[PDB]
């Protein structure tokens, strides 16, 4: 029926897609998630939203969702639509392995999800996935990589980027304290906590409000390791003290 | 009170207070027929009694009925839109025969009201279709649980009852007949028919004739669903 | 298998053996090949047991749903038509030789044989099964128009006993069923209740 | 007999707190070998291996269809699979194409990832699971190593006795089979380590 | 805006697209049918619009099976559609059960086809009521009528059309339960002429069809020798 | 299946969704292609460099085949569907013809696909234009431009994206046989046209040149500043 | 394969062997051929063992759907009719040869279910390749309404008659007693025959097998 | 023929308002409380029928999925049942593949993925149902909440329904991490007492527990024993 | 607000009524049927000087004996003139004869009004075609010329102008046409009328001319051939 339809996949008279641009504002009030590329790894630093006192600790993370042996993602937006996307990336990552017996290159996995995301913005009459989501990974062709994928279906490779709440303030801080070709992993963990203080409105960090995962190579095998609570509490205290030695 | 924003008035989507504004209108569609059905279960019996308004002299009154025989052992009374009524009866008669074909035993009243209500939920969640403006009251005798009186509604809610009413005087005959679920058992024997008739007689203030109502019974001694004849109803109507 | 139905004035008398063979091994010797399709309509099943049990369950579903809509006890011709439409659509898949007998208030005790292929004829008596071939001369010799209920019970028993004697695929007990206006009176003839016939001497 | 096209022989044996799995190395056509390094044992876990014999296109296909489904399983369920559950995963995979079956009869062998309880299994070509506590065989020389492992197997073997048993039962079977041989690889799966020994066999 | 679809109730629980579709029947001329002791007699006041139409165009009495007839009233293209539906149901019954379809069952199979278009926005309700009538030796005379909502009731007399209420009063004073079919035809033609307006709608051709015991249960048009002997009888009591 | 007419006609005979998809092209980054004698040069105008792009994967000059490469302007995600479906058709054409495509063939495939979503049910038009450059087997250079309407034309020089009304006014007064003579002078004709549109200025463009066999290569950032210093 | 069932006074006794052959060579010494369907219905399985696994597991899951939907104990006529309507649908191409049996609220019921989809409700049935040996014991010694001890001794004598007479049966006797109250799934009810005692010892010493290469990868 | 367009779309503020309105259907429902103890999870809800005529032993709000997973709702009654019969079907589709009882987290991931689909598929409204789902797998107790969006959350203890915000503050005071199951049933009943409006009896509530013996809902004889304390 | 298959109160079927208004924005095309051949002449409407004018193919071959002239939305024509070309080859495949000019017009105009949005196909037209087509060729009946309005209404014309300046060029075609003029006099008459109606200066770059004779096939004029005709005007 034409009366009840909302026309989710039409153009604005200015040339815009409303439901895409309205899905972009669902993400700007989601959990702040950032990613930093280093010379020996890529990290993810998601600000945890579900920080209630009566929550349990079931499965490995809250907003990471490892995709592959060699690459993981991190989501911000609609929590439920991200679970549908991350099952789909795991299928694409395993259909490439079934078809080629090599792990999926990370740019080819982001491209294939962004084709599914574009297809809901052009035909079908459905709402788009209100999930922008980061990507960290390793592959043979370019090594460590970092991607971001908006609900429009367009993606980009980044050295440092941020999605979620206060992403615009987080990007500008990553424009100045990031150095290209000069970031180690331990330097990038400290840059992650530095950005997650001026972009979270609370007084400080406590490591129950963040989740960090790093991706490195160890003897020819990619390891994806969510940092534990004490490993981030040492990084918070290494920045909560060093800020006192700079004023 | 009740807010509204969008097409909450027309399709089964949520009101801003989450009400299903369109499903609540199918309950108003039950009162459009102007009729009231009363159901009550005893200890060894379950009785349905409904009004029989043949408003035209030229109607064949043998066809003007709201009692329906779903299986040999399950009876029905319908209240609401009479065309939506007959559709849900044929779907209940069909779903009760697939049970016997697939599972080899007669369907309970438990699982026939559950399946018909699961059909009615689909109408309340798909926008392409309206709910059926009618409610079904099923009676029967289970093996272990005994007499059962179950009613499904246009929302998809199918709860079990000691005694049910439906239609126009539903609230006046639930508030009445819940006072007879007092000290023991609403006279839980074969003259729960007299409980069913005087409930419908009070809220209508009618003091019915022999052929102004129609009565359907099940019993434990007779688990088959029977429709009482007007000579059998007048044997009960003259007793009160 | 040896199945049989004889019509009398006021109802029908059914009859079957009880032997199901898997080759020349008797897999079951107490089968009930008289499947009730409704309250006054049975069928007798000959042929593939997986085929005749699936057709009889399908028609019991189709006839019981037919009677619940029409609010009338169904016709024996209506039941036999549902068997005919079943095993004519699927005549190259369903090896099922059926005979339908029953009683209805309209036209009384009726017998319909639906053999393999899916034709349907009303007959005053009909036999079917592998052992039916052995008693065509006997049922054509001593059938008489106007037998009573107990006179058709003796006739169906004598014809099934003569076919159980000559067929390896027939045996066990004789299952009789008399369907009338009042109801169904089933009985099992076992052991020394099967009619005995003399073999030659010397 | 289409499962004798490429030949092959896989055998898995249970010990005390350790399992062993073994296969031959021959890839072949009806009587012609092509390589002597053909993989028939695949790592379906930390300490859990599947071994596939039969038609070599299905030895490669089913091992890739299982690696497809197991990596979906290990990402979604967030844990490693238990060896009983892999058995039901293979039994679903082989039965889903029942009419027109995968011509492989796989054996699995592994340790319970939280008990270290030994587990060996064998499946038919349409996925009928066989859990035993002694030994499972599969391949062209099944009868050669049924009777060979009926004599040499002892209950509660050490890992060093288990290696000397499964390797004397593979060598004596595939040297009595024409289309099996060209080497034997053996995996001893224990709680602390996986030891893999290829061993000197007759190359005829 | 509670009346643009059949999948929408009103706030007082009414489906207006069904109730608008029965205004279309009320804008059609009156067709009556009377069930008597020997059978069922139909009668249609068939308004002939132009003089240019042939006598028999836009026929309102249908044969849906060889024992069942159908008098329609309303949107005529929808009526010929449902006549084909009632023919298919009567055909499929004999191809699946082997005997003539009962009028109770045929009326319920067609009314549930009409009801199926009162539920969705993808379709509209039918713009026609229609009576069905048959005779059997076993089942006797039967007359059912199906509304655009899809409700089917049995009648001794139904009077769908413009002058619905005015014709029901003429059928109610008739005592059809003891009268024979050749006496009802003389009365159906009386009721058609007394409800016809000789001012608003000018020209009209009477169509009559029985089904009864005198035809061995076949439905057919009343012959012109009996039709003209009832139109003459109807004008003589119209005065 | 969602079957609803999205692109419909309006009074005065306009397709609004086609017109509104062309407004999505005018909000995109500016792409310029000119056609020389034995050289075709595509250049896009990177709006922001931001010092944090991995610039390898936001390049707006793709490569359809070995002889055909295109540059787009508009919705970047809609282009990647068009770029990939043109690459499949360039390989099906080698499968059935045993020859590389002509530049007008894959332009007809892209334009008829772009027309198809302006007339099919349940689809919006592509919000892209495409400057397609290439070489025939004869060696004639080609330059084409598709629109969201599905219309395609050949061009000596063309510009799509934002500011393209001013870049095309530039190229219509500076495209001659003398500026299209040297292969290096043809490359500076795109860079001079882009620097009229880049409102921040500098070496913030991307540009790819395709000559004949020994085919397409995208120019490096310091290899582009050598031309911008030669036009300072 | 030798599977059997019987109906005693107030319950039902199922029995099976434990041999699974890959042709004429014994694969499984200890195959479990009595299968769970519901807490009151088990099913013995013969014929194609992969078919009887993947058929009884589906009817068990369908009755797990059906039971806690209805909220009551399932019936044996329901398990029959799911089985026979599925096996008729595949037209005998799946070889499920079944001795469905159990006790519902209507009593003890036992069915034999043939792979083409025919069923039969008897007080005693046997199926399998050693079924004809096991019917000979039941046609000899069955009487109606026996005790549990009399009926377990009869099914175990019938399964053992299939064991010692059929080449495709042996190695153990499984029992399953189902009554209105209890559920006795007796997995080695009888060991009629065991392996002979090895008179020698053939264990190889460490070093008897030559190796070519050797990898050791330790585990975390 | 079925509508093929999403009835849930993004609002200009970036919100899926049909999901946000289906949460309002949940927050008007009857209160449901789940508490994960150290050896069990208790699920309790207010089963308060409208009249005396309603059979309390007829329909159930605490429903078992498997032998080891049960769940309870706040929100709409009939939308729960379509969702609780698919949950019972997803649990057996796992069991046919893996021959292992389904993990409680994996059932919640499959149920919430269904509930996500009716926020994006054509012509359907979301469910007006939240779910407290319990289960015992791998020696650990589990408690999950499945929101109408399709998002799931593991909870130590939480509450839905009417006065859920007042009730969830009551959980944060009287929840010890090292309780037993028998001490968590009393604290779950007390949360249903913090907003009940009446005198709660054995028929006015419904309690379901899940320990290592599996899932079961408590008999009304067993509910009366816990109401004495 | 309203669907694509909706009649006006005047009974005009709105979307076709607006697809006719789309043609009045396209360039002017002229056809003249003489007894010695038909001629098809169209304005190219050069937008930019950098646009190569050899790509503005507003006249196409349908078969060797039929050529078509289009105006309106040129992208919409390419699905109609490809269905025109396949239908002539399917007619040649089955019947070994050239298809007549009327029946190619009849087959293409059956695709007009074959749109909708209610299960008309899995891939169906959402909207009508925004084109008018002038088919012109020589069949066994001789030279013929047909018009193909978006309503699927096809009509044989002796002379017909379509496009933005049709009302005013059709007034000029009715004055100068007669039933015995020559193809040389029709080519020349199709350019005096293009001179009245074009905005730019008429040269051999911004026009496109093609004729179909009974002897020769369809052919389109070259740059050298058009220069002779423009000097005669």
UniProtKB/Swiss-Prot annotation, chain A:
SUPFAM superfamilies: N-terminal nucleophile aminohydrolases (Ntn hydrolases). The modification Phosphoserine is found at residues 12, 74, 172. Transmembrane segments: none annotated. The modification N6-acetyllysine is found at residues 126, 175. The keyword Metal-binding does not apply. It comes from the Eukaryota. Component of the 20S core proteasome complex involved in the proteolytic degradation of most intracellular proteins. This complex plays numerous essential roles within the cell by associating with different regulatory particles. Associated with two 19S regulatory particles, forms the 26S proteasome and thus participates in the ATP-dependent degradation of ubiquitinated proteins. Belongs to the peptidase T1A family. This is Proteasome subunit alpha type-4. It comes from Homo sapiens. The gene is PSMA4.
Curated annotation (Swiss-Prot), chain C:
GO terms for cellular component: cytoplasm; cytosol; extracellular exosome; mitochondrion; nucleoplasm; nucleus; proteasome complex; proteasome core complex. It catalyses: Cleavage of peptide bonds with very broad specificity. GO terms for biological process: proteasome-mediated ubiquitin-dependent protein catabolic process. GO terms for molecular function: cadherin binding; endopeptidase activity; threonine-type endopeptidase activity. Its main location: cytoplasm. It comes from the Eukaryota. The active site is at residue 1. The modification Phosphothreonine is found at residue 35. Keywords: Acetylation, Cytoplasm, Host-virus interaction, Hydrolase, Nucleus, Phosphoprotein, Protease, Proteasome, Threonine protease, Zymogen. It is found in: Cytoplasm; Nucleus. Belongs to the peptidase T1B family. Component of the 20S core proteasome complex involved in the proteolytic degradation of most intracellular proteins. This complex plays numerous essential roles within the cell by associating with different regulatory particles. Associated with two 19S regulatory particles, forms the 26S proteasome and thus participates in the ATP-dependent degradation of ubiquitinated proteins. This is Proteasome subunit beta type-6. It comes from Homo sapiens. The gene is PSMB6. The chain holds residues 35 to 236 of 239 of the full protein.
UniProtKB/Swiss-Prot annotation, chain F:
Phosphorylation by ABL1 or ABL2 leads to an inhibition of proteasomal activity and cell cycle transition blocks. Keywords: Acetylation, Cytoplasm, Glycoprotein, Host-virus interaction, Nucleus, Phosphoprotein, Proteasome. The keyword Phosphoprotein applies. Glycans are attached at residue 129. It is found in: Cytoplasm; Nucleus. InterPro entries: Ntn_hydrolases_N, Proteasome_alpha, Proteasome_alpha-type, Proteasome_asu_N, Proteasome_sua/b. The modification N6-acetyllysine is found at residue 226. The modification Phosphotyrosine is found at residue 152. The keyword Acyltransferase does not apply. GO terms for biological process: proteasome-mediated ubiquitin-dependent protein catabolic process. GO terms for molecular function: identical protein binding. GO terms for cellular component: cytoplasm; cytosol; extracellular exosome; nucleoplasm; nucleus; proteasome complex; proteasome core complex; proteasome core complex, alpha-subunit complex. Pfam families: Proteasome, Proteasome_A_N. Induction: Down-regulated by the ribozyme Rz3'X. Up-regulated in colorectal cancer tissues. Component of the 20S core proteasome complex involved in the proteolytic degradation of most intracellular proteins. This complex plays numerous essential roles within the cell by associating with different regulatory particles. Associated with two 19S regulatory particles, forms the 26S proteasome and thus participates in the ATP-dependent degradation of ubiquitinated proteins. Belongs to the peptidase T1A family. This is Proteasome subunit alpha type-7. It comes from Homo sapiens (Human).
Swiss-Prot record, chain I:
Its main location: cytoplasm. It comes from the Eukaryota. The modification Phosphoserine is found at residues 8, 48, 55. One of its GO terms (cellular component) is secretory granule lumen. The lineage of its organism: Eukaryota, Metazoa, Chordata, Craniata, Vertebrata. The 26S proteasome consists of a 20S proteasome core and two 19S regulatory subunits. The 20S proteasome core is a barrel-shaped complex made of 28 subunits that are arranged in four stacked rings. The two outer rings are each formed by seven alpha subunits, and the two inner rings are formed by seven beta subunits. The proteolytic activity is exerted by three beta-subunits PSMB5, PSMB6 and PSMB7. PSMA5 interacts directly with the PSMG1-PSMG2 heterodimer which promotes 20S proteasome assembly. SMART domains: Proteasome_A_N (SM00948). Transmembrane segments: none annotated. This is Proteasome subunit alpha type-5. Component of the 20S core proteasome complex involved in the proteolytic degradation of most intracellular proteins. This complex plays numerous essential roles within the cell by associating with different regulatory particles. Associated with two 19S regulatory particles, forms the 26S proteasome and thus participates in the ATP-dependent degradation of ubiquitinated proteins. The keyword Glycoprotein applies. Keywords: Acetylation, Cytoplasm, Glycoprotein, Nucleus, Phosphoprotein, Proteasome. It comes from Homo sapiens. Expressed in fetal brain (at protein level).
């Amino acid at each position: 029926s034409r009366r009840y339809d909302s026309r989710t996949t039409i153009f604005s008279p200015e040339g815009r897609l409303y439901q895409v641009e309205y899905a972009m504002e669902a993400i700007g009030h989601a959990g702040t998630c950032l990613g930093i590329l280093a010379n020996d790894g890529v990290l993810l630093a998601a600000e945890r939203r579900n920080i209630h006192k009566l929550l349990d600790e079931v499965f490995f993370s809250e907003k990471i969702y490892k995709l592959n042996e060699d690459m993981a993602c991190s989501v911000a937006g609609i929590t439920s639509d991200a679970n549908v996307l991350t099952n789909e990336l795991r299928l694409i990552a395993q259909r490439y392995l079934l078809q080629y017996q090599e792990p999926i290159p990370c740019e080819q996995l982001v491209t294939a999800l962004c084709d599914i995301k574009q297809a809901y913005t052009q035909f079908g009459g459905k709402r788009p996935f209100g999930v922008s989501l980061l990507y960290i990974g390793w592959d043979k062709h370019y090594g460590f990589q970092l991607y971001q994928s908006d609900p429009s279906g367009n993606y980009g490779g980044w050295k440092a980027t941020c999605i979620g709440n206060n992403s615009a303030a987080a990007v500008s801080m990553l424009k100045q304290d990031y150095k290209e070709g000069e970031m180690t992993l331990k330097s990038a963990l400290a840059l992650a906590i530095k950005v997650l203080n001026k972009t979270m409105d609370v007084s400080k960090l406590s490591a129950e409000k963040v989740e960090i995962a790093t991706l490195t190579r160890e003897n020819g095998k990619t390891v994806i390791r969510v940092l534990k609570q004490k490993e981030v509490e040492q990084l918070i205290k290494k920045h909560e003290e060093e800020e006192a030695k700079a004023e | 009170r009740g807010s509204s924003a969008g097409f909450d008035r027309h399709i089964t989507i949520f009101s801003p207070e989450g009400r299903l504004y369109q499903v609540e209108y199918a309950f108003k569609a039950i009162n459009q027929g102007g009729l009231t059905s009363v159901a009550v279960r005893g200890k060894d019996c379950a009785v349905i009694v409904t009004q029989k308004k043949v408003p035209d002299k030229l109607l064949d009154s043998s066809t003007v009925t709201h009692l329906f025989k779903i299986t040999e052992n399950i009876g029905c009374v319908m209240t609401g839109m009479t065309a939506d009524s007959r559709s849900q009866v044929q779907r209940a008669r069909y779903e009760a025969a697939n049970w016997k074909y697939k599972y080899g035993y007669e369907i309970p009243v438990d699982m026939l009201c559950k399946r018909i209500a699961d059909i009615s939920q689909v109408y309340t969640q798909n926008a392409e279709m309206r709910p059926l403006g009618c409610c079904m009251i099923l009676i029967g005798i289970d093996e272990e649980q005994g007499p059962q009186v179950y009613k499904c509604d246009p929302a998809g809610y199918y709860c079990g009852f000691k005694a049910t009413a439906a239609g126009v005087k539903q609230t006046e005959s639930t508030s009445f007949l819940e006072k007879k679920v007092k000290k023991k058992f609403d006279w839980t024997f074969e003259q729960t028919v007299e409980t069913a008739i005087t409930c419908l007689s009070t809220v209508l203030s009618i003091d019915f004739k022999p052929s102004e109502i129609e009565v359907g019974v099940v019993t434990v001694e007779n688990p088959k669903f029977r429709i009482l004849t007007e000579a059998e109803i007048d044997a009960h109507l003259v007793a009160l | 298998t040896t199945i049989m139905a004889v019509q009398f004035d006021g109802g029908v008398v059914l009859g079957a053996d009880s032997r199901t063979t898997t080759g020349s091994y008797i897999a079951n010797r107490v089968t009930d090949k008289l499947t009730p399709i409704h309250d006054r309509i049975f069928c007798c099943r000959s042929g593939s047991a997986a085929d005749t049990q699936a057709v009889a369950d399908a028609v019991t579903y189709q006839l019981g749903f037919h009677s619940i809509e029409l609010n009338e006890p169904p016709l024996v011709h209506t039941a036999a038509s549902l068997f005919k439409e079943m095993c004519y659509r699927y005549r190259e898949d369903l090896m099922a030789g059926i005979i339908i007998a029953g009683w209805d208030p309209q036209e009384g005790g009726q017998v319909y044989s639906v053999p393999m292929g899916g034709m349907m004829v009303r007959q005053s008596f009909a036999i079917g099964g592998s052992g039916s071939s052995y008693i065509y001369g006997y049922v054509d010799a001593t059938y008489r128009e106007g037998m009573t209920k107990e006179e058709c019970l003796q006739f169906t028993a004598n014809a099934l006993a003569l076919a159980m004697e000559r067929d390896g695929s027939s045996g066990g007990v004789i299952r009789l069923a008399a369907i009338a206006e009042s109801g169904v009176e089933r009985q099992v003839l076992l052991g020394d209740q099967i009619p005995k016939f003399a073999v030659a001497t010397l | 007999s289409i499962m004798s096209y490429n030949g092959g022989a896989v055998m898995a044996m249970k010990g005390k707190n350790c399992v062993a799995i073994a296969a031959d190395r021959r890839f072949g056509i009806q009587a012609q070998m092509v390589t002597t390094d053909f993989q028939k044992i695949f790592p379906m876990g930390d300490r859990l291996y599947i071994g596939l014999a039969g038609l070599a296109t299905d030895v490669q296909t089913v091992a890739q269809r299982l690696k497809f489904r197991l990596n979906l399983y290990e990402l979604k369920e967030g844990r490693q699979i238990k060896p009983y559950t892999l058995m039901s995963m293979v039994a679903n995979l082989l039965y889903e194409k029942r009419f027109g079956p995968y011509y492989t009869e796989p054996v699995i062998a592994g340790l319970d990832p939280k008990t270290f309880k030994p587990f060996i299994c064998s499946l038919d070509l349409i996925g009928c699971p066989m859990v035993t506590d002694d030994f499972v065989v599969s391949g062209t020389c099944a009868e050669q190593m049924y009777g060979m492992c009926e004599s040499l197997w002892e209950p509660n073997m050490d890992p060093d006795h288990l290696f000397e048993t499964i390797s004397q039962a593979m060598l004596n079977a595939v040297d009595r089979d024409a289309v099996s041989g060209m080497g034997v690889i053996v995996h001893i799966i224990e709680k602390d380590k996986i030891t893999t020994r290829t061993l000197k066999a007759r190359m005829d | 805006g509670y009346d643009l679809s059949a999948s929408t109730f009103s706030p007082d629980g009414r489906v207006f697209q069904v109730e608008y579709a029965m205004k279309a029947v009320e804008n059609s001329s009156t067709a009556i049918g009377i069930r008597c002791k020997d059978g069922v007699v139909f009668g249609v006041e068939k308004l002939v619009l132009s003089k240019l139409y042939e006598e028999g165009s836009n026929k309102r009495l249908f044969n849906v099976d060889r024992h069942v007839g159908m008098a329609v009233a309303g949107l005529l293209a929808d009526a010929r559609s449902l006549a084909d539906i009632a023919r298919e149901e009567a055909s499929n019954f004999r191809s699946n059960f082997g005997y003539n379809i009962p009028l109770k069952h045929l009326a319920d199979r067609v009314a549930m086809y009409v009801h199926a278009y009162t539920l969705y926005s993808a379709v509209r309700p039918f713009g026609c009521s229609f009576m069905l009538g048959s005779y059997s030796v076993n089942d006797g005379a039967q007359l059912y009528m199906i509304d655009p909502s899809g409700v089917s009731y049995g009648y001794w007399g139904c009077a769908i059309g413009k002058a619905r209420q005015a014709a029901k009063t003429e059928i109610e004073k008739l005592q059809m339960k003891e009268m024979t079919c050749r006496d009802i035809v003389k009365e159906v033609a009386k009721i058609i002429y007394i409800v016809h307006d000789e001012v608003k709608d000018k020209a009209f051709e009477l169509e009559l069809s029985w089904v009864g015991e005198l035809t061995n249960g076949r439905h057919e048009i009343v012959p012109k020798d009996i039709r003209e002997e009832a139109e003459k009888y109807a004008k003589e009591s119209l005065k | 299946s969602y079957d609803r007419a999205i692109t419909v006609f309006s009074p005065d005979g306009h397709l609004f969704q086609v017109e509104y998809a062309q407004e999505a092209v005018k909000k995109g980054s500016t792409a310029v292609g000119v056609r020389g004698r034995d050289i075709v040069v595509l250049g896009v105008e990177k709006k922001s460099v931001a010092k944090l792009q991995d610039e390898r994967t936001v390049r707006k000059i793709c490569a359809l085949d070995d002889n055909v490469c295109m540059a787009f302007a508009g919705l970047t995600a809609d282009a990647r569907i068009v770029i990939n479906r043109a690459r499949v058709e360039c390989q099906s054409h080698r499968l059935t013809v045993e020859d590389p495509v002509t530049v007008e063939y894959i332009t007809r495939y892209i334009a008829s696909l772009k027309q198809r979503y302006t007339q099919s049910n349940g689809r919006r038009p592509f919000g892209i234009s495409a400057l397609i450059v290439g070489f025939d087997f004869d060696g004639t250079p080609r330059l084409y431009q598709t629109d969201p309407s599905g219309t395609y034309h050949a061009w000596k020089a063309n510009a799509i994206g934002r500011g393209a009304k001013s870049v095309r006014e530039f190229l219509e007064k500076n495209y001659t046989d003398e500026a299209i003579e040297t292969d290096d002078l043809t490359i500076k004709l795109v860079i001079k046209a882009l620097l009229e549109v880049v409102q921040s200025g500098g070496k913030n463009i991307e540009l790819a040149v395709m000559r004949r066999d020994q085919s397409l290569k995208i120019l490096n950032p310091e290899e582009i500043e050598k031309y911008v210093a030669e036009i300072e | 394969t030798t599977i059997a069932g019987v109906v005693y006074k107030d319950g039902i006794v199922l029995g099976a062997d434990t041999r699974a052959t890959e042709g004429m060579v014994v694969a499984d010494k200890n195959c479990s051929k009595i299968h769970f369907i519901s807490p009151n219905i088990y099913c013995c399985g013969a014929g194609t063992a992969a078919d009887t696994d993947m058929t009884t597991q589906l009817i068990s899951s369908n009755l797990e759907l059906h039971s806690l939907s209805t909220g009551r104990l399932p019936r044996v006529v329901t398990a029959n009719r799911m089985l026979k309507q599925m096996l008729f649908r595949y037209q005998g191409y799946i070889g499920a040869a079944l001795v469905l049996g159990g006790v519902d609220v209507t009593g003890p019921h036992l069915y034999s279910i043939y792979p083409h989809g025919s069923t039969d409700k008897l007080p005693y049935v046997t199926m399998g390749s050693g079924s004809l040996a096991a019917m000979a014991v039941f046609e000899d010694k069955f009487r109606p309404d026996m005790e549990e001890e009399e009926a377990k001794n009869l099914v175990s004598e019938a399964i053992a008659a299939g064991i010692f007479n059929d080449l495709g049966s042996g190695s153990n006797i499984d029992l399953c007693v189902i009554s209105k109250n209890k559920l006795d799934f007796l997995r080695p009810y009888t060991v009629p025959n065991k392996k002979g005692t090895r008179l020698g010892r053939y264990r190889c010493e460490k070093g008897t097998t030559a190796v070519l290469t050797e990898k050791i990868t330790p585990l975390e | 023929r079925g509508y093929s367009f999403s009835l849930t779309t993004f609002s200009p503020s970036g919100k899926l308002v049909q999901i946000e309105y289906a949460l309002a259907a949940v927050a008007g429902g009857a209160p449901s409380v789940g508490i994960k103890a150290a050896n069990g999870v208790v699920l309790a809800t207010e089963k308060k029928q409208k009249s005396i005529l309603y059979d309390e032993r007829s329909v159930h709000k605490v429903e078992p999925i498997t032998k080891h997973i049960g769940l309870v709702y706040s929100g709409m009654g009939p939308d729960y049942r379509v969702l609780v019969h698919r949950a019972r079907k997803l649990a057996q589709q796992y069991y046919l593949v893996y021959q292992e009882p389904i993990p409680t987290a994996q059932l919640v991931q499959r149920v919430a993925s269904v509930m996500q689909e009716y926020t994006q598929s054509g012509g359907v409204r979301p469910f007006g149902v939240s779910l407290l789902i319990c289960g015992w797998n791998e020696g650990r107790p589990y408690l999950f909440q499945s929101d109408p969006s399709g998002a799931y959350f593991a909870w130590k203890a939480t509450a839905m329904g009417k006065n859920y915000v007042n009730g969830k503050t009551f959980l944060e005071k009287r929840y010890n991490e090292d309780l037993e199951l028998e001490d968590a049933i009393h604290t779950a009943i007390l949360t249903l007492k913090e907003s009940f409006e009446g005198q709660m009896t054995e028929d006015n509530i419904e309690v379901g527990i899940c320990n290592e013996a599996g899932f079961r809902r408590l008999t009304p004889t067993e509910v009366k024993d816990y109401l004495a304390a | 607000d309203r669907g694509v298959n909706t009649f006006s109160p005047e009974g005009r079927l709105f979307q076709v009524e607006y697809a006719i208004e789309a043609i009045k924005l396209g360039s002017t095309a002229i056809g003249i049927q003489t007894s010695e051949g038909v001629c098809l002449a169209v304005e190219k409407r050069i937008t930019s000087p950098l646009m190569e004018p050899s790509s503005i193919e507003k006249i196409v071959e349908i078969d060797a004996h039929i050529g078509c002239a289009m105006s309106g939305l040129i992208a919409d024509a390419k699905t109609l003139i490809d269905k025109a070309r396949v239908e002539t080859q399917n007619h040649w495949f089955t019947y070994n004869e050239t298809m007549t000019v009327e029946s190619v017009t009849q087959a293409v105009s059956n695709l007009a009004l074959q749109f909708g949005e209610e299960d008309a196909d899995p891939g169906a037209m959402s909207r009508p075609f925004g084109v008018a087509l002038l088919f012109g060729g020589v069949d066994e009946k001789g030279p013929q010329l047909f018009h193909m309005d978006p309503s699927g209404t096809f009509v044989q014309c002796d002379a017909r102008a379509i496009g933005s300046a049709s009302e005013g060029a059709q007034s000029s075609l009715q004055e100068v046409y007669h039933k015995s003029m020559t193809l040389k006099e029709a080519i020349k008459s199709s350019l005096i009328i293009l001179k009245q109606v074009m905005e730019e200066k008429l040269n051999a770059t911004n026009i496109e001319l093609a004729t179909v004779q009974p002897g020769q096939n369809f052919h389109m004029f070259t740059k050298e051939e058009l220069e002779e005709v423009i000097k005669d005007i």
